[PDB]
């Protein structure tokens, strides 16, 4: 009637003390592990092989069929053709993409028939003036950044390009490969017995 209440109170208080001591030990243990922080400005994280960055445009390959304008979610790419009258050839006068309105879904890059349009790994776009985000046909090629070729950045692979069993990519040797073998290697092994 009154002793059961007190024994329940004790079994609750000692349990609450142990379940705070355990958490205290866990937190004091957590400060021995190496921080997973990817210290961005000097430890930029190298993107994947399918990362959809800034669009790249090869003015010479464009044939002005406007499929980029047609599969765009917002019909963004401005294509200005004139249709010269030599025999039938369309002529491109100005190709542009307002990257301020852009969605980076890369439908345009998926349906370019002439491989004229591609994705890059430039995620570092930022300006003081959004009117400077409208890229001319010339400001689009510009030979992308390539984080690896930067003298003040130690690139860090992400989880999908680390060898088997490896979880973090900070303390990594200089000879790691992605996870397994490529198809050509497996076929070459199967070729010999």
């Amino acid at each position: 009637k009154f002793l059961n209440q007190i024994t329940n109170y004790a079994k609750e208080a000692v349990q609450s003390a142990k379940y705070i001591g355990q958490g205290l030990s866990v937190t004091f243990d957590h400060m021995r592990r190496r921080p997973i922080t990817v210290q961005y400005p000097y430890e930029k994280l190298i993107p994947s092989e399918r990362f959809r960055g800034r669009i790249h445009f090869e003015f010479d390959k464009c044939i002005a069929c406007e499929v980029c304008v047609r599969v765009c979610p917002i019909n963004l790419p401005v294509v200005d053709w004139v249709f010269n009258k030599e025999l039938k050839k369309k002529e491109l006068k100005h190709y542009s993409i307002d990257f301020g309105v852009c969605i980076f879904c890369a439908n345009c890059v998926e349906y370019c028939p002439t491989n004229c349009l591609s994705v890059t790994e430039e995620y570092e776009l930022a300006t003081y003036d959004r009117h400077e985000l409208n890229y001319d046909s010339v400001a689009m090629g510009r030979i992308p950044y390539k984080v690896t070729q930067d003298p003040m950045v130690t690139p860090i692979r992400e989880f999908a390009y680390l060898p088997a069993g490896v979880m973090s990519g900070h303390d990594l040797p200089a000879g790691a490969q992605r996870a397994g073998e490529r198809p050509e290697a497996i076929a070459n092994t199967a070729k010999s017995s």
Partner: protein, 55 residues
């Protein structure tokens, strides 16, 4: 190493190791290789030394 050629990547310290692509543009000594694969054609810039003009 000229544009239009099909090249492979020979640098064990790169995520695009042993990938094969086509040279889209070369300026200032560095190249730009387009890997047509997966779904979206990727384009990344390599040094003139981290390639090999595969036949």
């Amino acid at each position: 190493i000229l544009p239009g050629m099909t090249v492979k990547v020979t640098n064990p310290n790169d995520t695009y190791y042993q990938f094969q692509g086509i040279v889209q543009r070369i300026t200032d000594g560095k190249v730009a290789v387009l890997f047509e694969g997966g779904n979206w054609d990727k384009l990344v810039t390599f040094q003139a030394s981290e390639l090999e003009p595969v036949v």
